[model samples]
Target: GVQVETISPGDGRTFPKRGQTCVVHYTGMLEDGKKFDSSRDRNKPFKFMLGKQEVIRGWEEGVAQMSVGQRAKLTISPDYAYGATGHPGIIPPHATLVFDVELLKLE
Candidate 1:
């Protein structure tokens, strides 16, 4: 479960469909707001097919709820996140994840 804040979400009248690859930008962090990773920091928007399981469950669910050019803030609980095992060397176990994410492109 997560609380979504669709700040500046787009009104393109077109959100990416299930099989479409979408480009997104994101900054990942913990509940304390400590930065862990960033696609923008790497100078590249992360791209993946929406329904292909290429990304985390939160991302798939969150990004699908947004339209092209949309920007949002998300607080994803552990269940919809990395779960009990969490991400090794990056995220802690059972931690709540936060993200500043944007839908960059779709094709």
Candidate 2:
């Protein structure tokens, strides 16, 4: 499952279109705050097509609903993420992930 909790609302009511490229910054961690990945640390935003399978299901479902400049915390269950077989050496199996994501813009 995926749960999106807005941290800061973006301007207007505009949201990302299905096939638009979304640029975002995010820090991904476990429920206990153990960080596994981060685009912020790389000083680069992650880009992906919305509604496409370029990323995890949680990100697809949650980020698709976000507007530009919006920041949110996504509480994602395993089913919506990597599921029972998480990314080896990075995420544990059946782990529920937490991501602090910011939708920087769309293209």
Candidate 3:
């Protein structure tokens, strides 16, 4: 089962809406704890619009559950991730991914 926890829950007035931009810093990794990607390493949060499939399925689901300034750790199953045909270089086939995500802004 997928597990999602808000490491830092927010008191923000609203959550991001469809087509709205959300800025977040995230670290993506395998179930084994091998890191695949990290927005924090880049020293800046990445921005994406909600409900647009701009990122993975899990991200869309996870982001929808979050409000501005919230931080959450999500355990995403393969179906919500890459599925059978995973990303060629970045993800292994049918990999379960763990992401520590910080929602910094909603605009």
The best candidate by TM-score is 2
lDDT tens digits by residue: candidate 1, 19-102: 998988899999998999999899898889989987778888887888888899988989889999998999888999999988
Question: lDDT for each of the candidates?
Answer: 0.87, 0.93, 0.87
Better of 2 and 3 by lDDT: 2
> What is the C-alpha lDDT profile of model 3 across 8-100, one tens digit per residue?
887666787889999989999898899999989999889998888878888888888888778899999999989999999889788989999
Q: Residue by residue across 22-59, what tens digits does model 2's lDDT show?
A: 99999999999999989999999999998778899999
* lDDT value for model 2: 0.93
- As a whole number from 0 to 100, the lDDT of residue 34 in candidate 1 is 100
Give candidate 1 misplaced runs (Cα > 4 Å): none
Q: Model 2: runs farther than 4 Å from truth?
A: none
- What's each prediction's TM-score? 0.93, 0.96, 0.92
Query: What is candidate 2's TM-score against the reference?
Result: 0.96
Error of 1 at 91 (Å): 0.5
